[model samples]
Target: EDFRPVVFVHGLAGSAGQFESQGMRFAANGYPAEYVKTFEYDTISWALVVETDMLFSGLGSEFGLNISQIIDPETLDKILSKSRERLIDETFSRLDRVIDEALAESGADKVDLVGHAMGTFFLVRYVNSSPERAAKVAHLILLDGVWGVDAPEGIPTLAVFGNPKALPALGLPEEKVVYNATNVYFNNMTHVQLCTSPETFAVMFEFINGYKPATTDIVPQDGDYVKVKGKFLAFATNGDVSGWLSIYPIDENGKRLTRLPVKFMRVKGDFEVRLRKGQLYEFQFRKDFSPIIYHYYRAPFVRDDLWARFLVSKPPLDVELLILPERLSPAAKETSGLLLIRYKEMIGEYDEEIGGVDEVYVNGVNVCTERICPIERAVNGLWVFDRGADGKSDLDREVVRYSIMPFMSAADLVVPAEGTISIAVKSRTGGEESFTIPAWSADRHSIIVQFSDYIV
Candidate 1:
């Protein structure tokens, strides 16, 4: 029970999602829920500064999103400046608050800090900002980060870096980042891979604890049900939104079991719900002052989760782009909207086919392949919907806009408004996994299929 409270800060354009898997891993090894937390700041401003065109250009009304109403030059400039300045004061202050909360909750004298990419830069600055701040931190963990200085002033540090070529291209090379520390390198992993992969987690656990972990897998709890809780956040702003969450119990085929939801909450900032293990459920989020509604359907919760984030679009920031390219409307038609997700990159070509390739199917139609989920792209998710509305499955041609986004791929695979919908995935390195849910129409319901990143 010598585990120190851990705090994680995400990289640019990343959310707590990056660390959520690691959190589960921590729980598996021996960390309590209260001991782990993630600090989320406004990286949307960084997106505006670095890739404004790619982030906003491909988005238009064709996808049920009005781009003209979302952004203007003046507003963009203000947001950029705010984010730039936030890199200093606002960032430090927010981090301090989370650290304080972690310490208070865990009753720990010092906390361990984990940072990824740009987050490593800010964390290094925070550690070196003042002697008082430095004393409060026990160890520093840097994952493929931007190096400014090491934890120079007497702090145990563990630094992990990916391939040198990929690191330099990401604007922060490996060798320059951390020195006089427990340095590790993964020549095969990419920037994001260095942070999220289970291999990295194995090293991280051994470093934080005195001994190696028993296992790196996310072991599910032994029960019929598990508790799940999370926040309703505004898209790019990362601000909290007040809303209502309607939870409907669904059958194995994604169909609602009842006419009314089993539970409802007048959500202010966060909400919690108990769900049966290995069961599918539908979450509907509706807020005030906006006619938009978001319906979320995903794989069952095998364990208690604390970092689930449901995003709603805020003005000037289409959060939908975080998970999807365009807005998918809830139309009274026979089409179903889906977003397939996995933490591991879904690659297309693998060792000339004998080694195997990624294959994902929706209602028997294969949507993942070398043409759609390419290797270099490192596509981690796919957006599915019928763009043509002509009652045909255009497997490869449509959803070309996902190319502009990072770590994402898309296709126009139309799942008819009919019986149960089944989605199955066979990763090159992982075992086959599948789930099913009722085929709700695209106008009223949307589905999110989440696949396990690790091998079974």
Candidate 2:
């Protein structure tokens, strides 16, 4: 095909905006607006296997059924999985739609696929799912997707990595780790930063157009005196910054000298302007990554994710983290129990430890730890992401059960797959013990986890 379209799929909790500017860059380079498309999925409800949510539409439009669709495990299975197969199948279904749409709209026989982080998993599965679908792919571009990575022989792939150990962390073969396809490195970037970095942009353009631009689409920095470079993101109370905000070049008086464009990773108005060795810079954005408008007063915040990273401060360095988790428990009931984490995924885990015991927060007050686990994939209860008319999106934590995502001490866990993890606890008057979430199999699953107790 002469003019094939490009389809972009985002990672978990990510949206179309991850590739928004990338789309613009395509047009600027020659691929028109219509030729560049993106696939958006439910980061929250995705774990539940539902396509859309009626309770949590940001614009106030509830689309799904009420306590009504809860019949015959349609919505039931979507909530609790007997296996990860169903969830994986759902992801495939959504991705298939994306590929078909791009092909149809562009009227091209082949299309290029671009995925970021978890989104890359969907892309790889889509290409490998069928022969017909695979043939329509011109090239595969992967940006930071982990776990298992694969491609049919001779498909012409571009794998951009943020970590040198990504190969092992993803459990790939020994040879495949170092040189799989045309590989690019950006270990200095965060997961979200991969798609936005200028270096990444160069590689993508070269692969698609066969030539890298002398410069980048984004203005990393445009002439400012007080420049500091480093990490940046999110929202709600406890002083969380939710919406997309920016960095202003401030004068000696602490007044913004010029309005510099910036993006916050999530939705909210509150913000934190970190100074690397005392300098100011920008970070990444969310579904709406613009600095123009944002949602207000949401709880919890995300500490990672950047809108911008500049030069010559503490110097530009990227860090990769795999929320590693370790757990231990008590033997019998002593005095009290360390009721640490709730049954929640901790979308980056705002699974904060308020009362003491074990917990972590990411700052818009969210939490994500780079620990290991034997995580359980089943028993996820119903969770609703409701948007209060105030433009804030929050999990109705009071009504729904917690996400079975694992956690750790004073830090949240960052897990990509499902497995079991134990925790050491201190009950008011308890002995030493460890916890177990008996691994869930395709035949057995639940929405509830009953922690065994040696009662008095």
Candidate 3:
């Protein structure tokens, strides 16, 4: 409603897109078009100090500081033959362009600035370097960065730290703590997560609204977006990780499967999700683009071979993800049995390989759900229908045969006959897992890669 524009500066490895979700949240709640923007910069291939300096020089223009002094007339136009100066000059040059553009469009003398990760580091230096520019900022928001930031006197500021452990170093005591959802995901309160998390978005919304909304959770009252909330409590192995969730509604014959956009969610504790409720049911997401696909199952974190009905029932369903310790364990730093891998395709999808497995040792008849032999080719490139066959074609019923033998360090059944398969031949990588998949087992010659990425 007013002329207060908010500008986002991303971290060292971040881009403007990191705030994609948050921008929507703000706009839905009334952030005007001219008031929301992100400053994009090249983070790699240059000295950070130079970039910070450039940022100051550019931001200073918005406050009427001598842009000529900000940029050296002697070297501004020249392609310097050095390191520090060129980087600094170039960065400020880019930054100067945006500040002027933003200031003119908003007709606001001062604006709000938010910085994340290394962006915070660069921003603090940039503002502190130019007292005039510092005065041009009505407020500042610092997400988790390597070092803490101190806003110049008289400027309003909000500092949201990602790692709770970083507080002492940041000179911020708990009394000043903003949020630490470690109560939900202790292992995942990372700087990147804080950038787009629902929690962080809520903070931004509350700050912009000037006060917390009447609603407990800071979601906009725009629609009946379906809400899904739950925690990741351990059953056997104590662990969990954060990743994306994509929901899809399948039409009969998998003809017109509609997949909802991906959203972030944490594991190992309580988390919430909101989506447009429709007659949709199937849900899955690819973690690290792995072959194993994680499908949505009914709570208690167990497998349901599901078609989970929601809108039809109008329930804010609670779902728990059971992450087997063997599944989440860090990769084996050492060696193990002969790990062999094979690839298969279920109908027309390649993303199913995810939830399959990462690194586990196959020990005889009883599979070690704790850790399965890691597969090699089971790597990159997520799955997609290589072309035709929409669940009712000759290709859908194609019986592909794969003869995997003596493939040494290598890597399914009743699983998807069309998706990639992973198999293993226990060998003498010399032991930890005492059992073995007898190289002679008839089943070893031909295997059926099995999994449940499809609705039963």
Candidate 4:
């Protein structure tokens, strides 16, 4: 069976990070990394442009943004209109380039496109923008997006929603649109789950092909090592931001095995390295004179990945407030941070309705409780750190601005910038796993812990 190249467009405040798991799953199903791609851009910038337009045009009352309080209406309109036009033009042009690159690299005439939420909105706009561009797409997988009865430009579209009420909420047509067009609703998933769930992936696989996937699990390739390569992007913008990186082979205790890293690169745009299948390694990133360094501790690679992104925040564009509930400052030199993530499931829910209590422990303390990981929030990724940088741990449950938004959560739990740190996770049904990592100073570094969604 020949597989067509697949391209993903992420939604607002999203990046290629949203598509990384799907890319790995595709690879596990024997799809090459080169054939799976993502269109990364500055979502925050786009949101600001949209907000400015809405506020100035009297449409922002519902959103309750007071942009009028800051800039004069005349200046706001002039600056934002140009910014909006430029953003739209640049985004679409970049998408076109990425699509062309995928097709050329894969030797395919057309590609399959997957878009989530606001990304689906952009996809529709792009399709309607021109006939030639729309001709290059073979199939459309629309997730958690509002749509009309007709498929955009008559492309074979698969509209997927997380709940039954989703369709009616959009007031879309009750029946299917075209011969190949259809809609699917999952009863037990949230907005982000609709995009990341393995069950959803099976549906997508079958929709793209005529048969179901061989397996929903990401099967490991029969090899001792696998090739991994990806971009070093700025957090919200997702642009190729150049910086230096050090890859250190580490032991179970998160201590470097050697005195020096096996590989170190002064990255201009991207980096590539071969990693042992089950061995853990620390991917560290730093820039000149910048005190902050990011230490990424990921699950061992079972397959090749082209979408491995290390997102850092550069000065003017450092808007981590969009995701992180509490931003770590450079002055907070004595603390540390953790961005714990599991793509397959939510992090902090202790309710029995979903199964049983899911608990996450930092140094044996249960950080994920009913208060922190409420069932309703459905938070999958959590940023754990000291809230006020007061050298105290509250383990408090704070309200993230977009708690209603999908895939983001946080806890004011402290991990001091001291010796080795132990992190463990136990799910009611998903089994448990633990990691021992160094407590890198929060002023200089933060750690990203990527745990497996599968049972250990």
Candidate 5:
């Protein structure tokens, strides 16, 4: 494996030893020890100056310095006398000269950098001063870096923070912050532990080593930021740790930015069911963590199967069917009807002579039976019906108790509107029935339906 060198900058009141455990971990996992370098600075006074000076010294030491005589003391003093706000600029100017000399001497082009806490502020300032020089950096890992209110752009940055408030505070530009980042957050982990704990190193390793370059060139846009939004699947017995899985959005900078409402569905062991494509479904899982939250952003490709597998792996339970949209309009109820179904499995042979027998009852009325028609899976080249049943026979007629079914497809049923709608199923006596589900809205739409006895 080609080793990528990483330069570590400690936070305020921290030293090079702050990342000692992390350095060792990376080395053990095949990262070269020589590639791991940390900067040490005085935590007590003028941290920015001390840190920048150390960074320059480190760069000079590793790459080698020019053989020129030292600068005049008065000029050096004047350079150091710059205001605290301009200190970052002054430091970069000095570092730029050093880097130029080093590059001319050693002939290497670029390097990678990692900064933690206050060190992050220093790095950002340096990069902003010399974006061309900063661009030479292959990767910039910000360990709890404070970009405050404004996010930096164009850099391949990896920011890890425990506080949710940091991102907005950094004044980070929307375009520059790639939402797709290796962000790790633990409710129990304080700001301090997030930067220095073993957990931080583990997360970092997976991020750096596991990252694969994009096959396609998708420019980072306003909604393209990657965030690691997690939901707790299971709680710790001793309240130690919560098991979480990262969730990305189905769309960019949209409603599903942090959480997708997934409903965990349960199927009886006797049923041999397959989730056919194009079914209107939602997902949910057991609350492994106290306050379940998920991060959402669109991935490069459709990950339906991957998402399904993630839900399945969590605690097994029946998903609560969401019949009503969270925000529904009053008109939504007037135009829509609640679709309800209950399934009954039967094992039998279809015989024209005997005339296959499958019947569906709604609200105690035997509305349809297979004897009058025949069961078929596909309807108009679409997998609408789970079982194939001819529509001709009134005995087994395709029944729609509500008037809306005749005018709308299942996909069009649940549409956003101004009001609410509510419907309930009193009973189901026979064959499995599938109904077209509707969309969400400002009004509340509710449905209650249940299945009856049938032989499999």
Candidate 6:
């Protein structure tokens, strides 16, 4: 389908170049480059109001010189005065006249509009004040509009905001508007970054080209125009104050459109959530390298937990060990020196052998014949069942142990002198369960764990 020509208006302190990249992107994506035009003005605050007036005035003057066949200033003024009201009326009156002339000249009645930042204020005022003229606009695209405090009714409107807080400030009631407004946030990206990034270009292209709103409130209908309410999409960079996009429908009386769901994704932490219609959400940063764990529960829904854990283990050896909770014993907690053991027979298989003999291995080598002693004296490394002992086979039963000597370096994998190990468990019937444990060292370990049960 052929898209209506897009007229771009830049923000305060910005130039036509603000949309240079976007224009190129649109053209490359099959949009007619000739349809992309920019209106340049002095970079000044509230210049939007002035620029809007000038553009209409210029169009009016050009129309008088070309069509209408009536060139008298008084006649032209009389014609314009009959067409519109005060500031807005006067501006759109001239705009309407020029547009009518353009349509007569080109055989088309509508065009697309794209405004950035401050320019959006003027565009909103124009559309809101002149619904008939707005109907002639095929589409309206607003980029990072700060003055979108009201929704323009009866037209397809696309709005983008760089700040999260800016969204709620738009005074437009949630249920009424020309089209559903999609508010997208760019998290930590600055105002200028919005125009410079390739991603932003793609967003613009999609808004202008791929957008197709639902046809009716309750049923699916097909048409070039779709009705929208206060629906918006918000984007953020790791939950930062970057940018957002909002789209709205303006074709209905009282603009009874629904607010679209808002979703968030965080950059640095394990953070994501969806906002219900008309609900507001906020985010705050805690600290770097901090571990964050989240849990969700519902009686009929699966219960689940997620954690972001930082690892501290050094290289050449990065291992996460999981010990069964049932394996712990009172004796295991009290002793300063404990054996890290592997039993040849499973824990329940003790009765299979006479006296239940098990073999010992340390550091990947066998030392079953060595003597067993307290951790401090065993620092030099002693084995169980000392040399020449017949219980070698007993040690060979494969049970092993580790002596936790106190003087070992911190790098050693010895448990702290005192402290009970605590474990938390979670289960899900349909969703996954996951946890992250902090690293044993600051420089080398970073890991995340996820587990899920697919069936009830």
Clashes of each: 8, 64, 43, 1, 61, 73
Q: Rate the local accuracy (lDDT) of all candidates.
A: 0.70, 0.39, 0.39, 0.70, 0.37, 0.35
lDDT of 5 by residue, 239-266 (tens): 1123333222222212233354432333
Model 3, residue 55: C-alpha shift (Å): 19
Give the per-residue lDDT digits (tens) of candidate 1, residues 211-285. 878988878889898887788876546777897789988766666888988888898867888888877788887
Per-model TM values vs. the true structure = 0.84, 0.42, 0.42, 0.83, 0.33, 0.33
TM-score of structure candidate 4 = 0.83
Give the better candidate number (1 or 2) by TM-score. 1
* CA lDDT for candidate 1: 0.70
Best by TM-score: 1
lDDT of 3 by residue, 1-456 (tens): 664777888754345545645554565555564467776664433322344343344311121122233334544444234477556667656665677677888788887888876677667666766676777787777776533224546666677654343212224323333232111122224334467666676676566557753432223343445444433322111123344555454443222254444454433233555555433344444334234444432111121111111110000110011112212323211111121211111111112312232223232222322211222211111111111222221223322211110111112212123222223322111122121111221111121121211111
In Å, residue 284's CA in model 4 sits off its true spot by: 1.4
Q: Which window of 10 residues has the lowest lDDT sum in candidate 3?
A: 311-320
RMSD of each: 5.3, 18.2, 19.0, 4.7, 25.4, 29.3
Worst 10 residues of 1 by lDDT: 58-67
Q: State the displacement of the C-alpha of residue 295, model 2, in Å, after optimal TM-score superposition.
A: 4.9
Please report how far candidate 1 places residue 354 from its true position, in Å: 14
TM-score result, candidate 3: 0.42
**lDDT tens digits, residue span 176-225, model 4:** 23234687767555556568778888899899888977878777788898
True lDDT of residue 280, candidate 2: 31
Error of 2 at 451 (Å): 42
